[PDB]
């Protein structure tokens, strides 16, 4: 061995294991899915109740970067909200210098280069987080990007990060997100995260949803309570 201690050494077949070891820390965080509808993006995070002592609304795995940009994370939570600070700080310098709201193809480009810069040196480690970015503009439509711990970003019509990643995006392509508005989506986001994580491994869990589009007038915010109670009314009909 010895070829996998630093992030500055290639393997004798040419790959960095410190990045691949940090990717393995993502599959212990639970599940964060997000699909974009015809006219908006809907996030969704299923949230483990570790003990009864915590408070409903603690330690949110679903951030708010700019007025229109949203973030849902999966990984090591201290590194997640560290990336959420620089992305929130990057969007401020765009507006203060260029005058208008930052677009997503540039915003996910600036963050991913900051993530990539920690996979070159022995002095730092790679981040242990993967996350998603989604927004809506009236001149651009909806956008949905995703960033791995290596620093690779792409666009998606729907993506998933967590433990059961393939078991979640199996059912995403059963949907038809090209035509659905972001009202029927909210019932379908919650349904596909109910069929995952059987009650053997986890006792109880918590739904946490997010929501952006022109129905939210471009601003990013959480769903109201009554709409996600309809999705939890749409919970126990997957047993047929």
């Amino acid at each position: 061995t010895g070829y996998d201690l630093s992030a500055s050494t290639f393997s004798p077949d040419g790959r960095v294991f410190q990045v691949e070891y940090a990717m393995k820390a993502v599959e212990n965080s639970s599940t964060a899915i997000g699909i974009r509808c015809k006219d908006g993006v809907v996030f969704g995070v299923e949230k483990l109740v570790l003990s009864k002592l915590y408070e409903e609304g603690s330690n949110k795995r679903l951030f708010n970067v700019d007025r229109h940009v949203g973030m849902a994370v999966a990984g090591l939570l201290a590194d997640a909200r560290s990336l959420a600070d620089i992305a929130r700080e990057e969007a401020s310098n765009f507006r203060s210098n260029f005058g208008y709201n930052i677009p997503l193809k540039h915003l996910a480009d600036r963050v991913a280069m900051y993530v990539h810069a920690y996979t070159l040196y022995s002095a730092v480690r790679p981040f242990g987080c993967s996350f998603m970015l989604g927004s809506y503009s009236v001149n651009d439509g909806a956008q949905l990007y995703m960033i791995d711990p290596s620093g690779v970003s792409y666009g998606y019509w729907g993506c998933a990060i967590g433990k059961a990643r393939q078991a979640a995006k199996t059912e995403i392509e059963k949907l038809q997100m090209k035509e659905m508005t972001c009202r029927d989506i909210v019932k379908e986001v919650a349904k596909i995260i109910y069929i995952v994580h059987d009650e053997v491994k986890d006792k109880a869990f918590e739904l946490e949803l997010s929501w952006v589009g022109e129905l939210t007038n471009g601003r990013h915010e959480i769903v109201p309570k009554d709409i996600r109670e309809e999705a939890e009314k749409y919970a126990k009909e997957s047993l047929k």
């Binding site: 500055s8 792409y154 392509e173």
Partner: protein, 240 residues
């Protein structure tokens, strides 16, 4: 063959070799991807494939062709996170040529500045030397078209036909038999002899959705990316 930490950092072996660079050439091959560039009499064509495995992924964000300047385009092989960071340097170094010197940068002077930056990574014992390659095309006055490759060792040379990636050696054995029969090359012939290079090496006989073609010509020196409709025009004319 080895003594000290010469397997780990960029210092010399007893044989005069140094292993961290030649470990990094075969980090290009982990993409599973191959690109071909051919220079013509009055044009230059880059062709490369793209592999889209999912329907959930947006097919418009997986382009390996990048526009460096208005008259210079490039294709990237190797790992994705290091390749996109290197494009960010080349866009930056070309803008400083125009600001300092007041005219458009030649394509060989741009490739020299990239290889000098890549030389420093294999020169200090701290950094990791960016396992991805670099192929540029462009039109230079009183020189016609010209193609350059930069590898992560800091080496560069001007070519007449170029391959890079997994199937590099089989494609260069194909092209050197093609060029030494000394046929004249029009626009459509260079496109035909570049598609049929990797169509016989990879043995695919594809449809117009898996490849992407950038081009430059001395009648319109803008680097432009071909539409799938007009790729299909070349593709059905290839099967006589």
């Amino acid at each position: 063959s080895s003594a000290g930490f010469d397997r780990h950092i960029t210092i010399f072996s007893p044989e005069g070799r140094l292993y961290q660079v030649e470990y990094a050439f075969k980090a290009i091959n982990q993409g599973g991807l191959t690109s071909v560039a051919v220079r013509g009499k009055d044009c230059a064509v880059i062709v490369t494939q793209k592999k889209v495995p999912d329907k959930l992924l947006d097919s418009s964000t997986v382009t390996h062709l990048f526009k460096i300047t208005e008259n210079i385009g490039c294709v990237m092989t190797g790992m994705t996170a290091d390749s996109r960071s290197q494009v960010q340097r080349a866009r930056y170094e070309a803008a400083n040529w125009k600001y300092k010197y007041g005219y458009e940068i030649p394509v060989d002077m741009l490739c020299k500045r990239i290889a000098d930056i890549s030389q420093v990574y294999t020169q200090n014992a701290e950094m990791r030397p960016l396992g991805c390659c670099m192929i540029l095309i462009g039109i230079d006055e009183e020189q016609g078209p010209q193609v350059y490759k930069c590898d992560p060792a800091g080496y560069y040379c001007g070519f007449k036909a170029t391959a890079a990636g997994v199937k590099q050696t089989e494609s260069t054995s194909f092209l050197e038999k093609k060029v030494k029969k000394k046929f004249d090359w029009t626009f459509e012939q260079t496109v035909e002899t570049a598609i049929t290079c990797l169509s016989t090496v990879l043995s695919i006989d594809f449809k117009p959705s898996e490849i992407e073609v950038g081009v430059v010509t001395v009648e319109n020196p803008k680097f432009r990316i071909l539409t799938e409709a007009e790729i299909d025009a070349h593709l059905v004319a290839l099967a006589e």
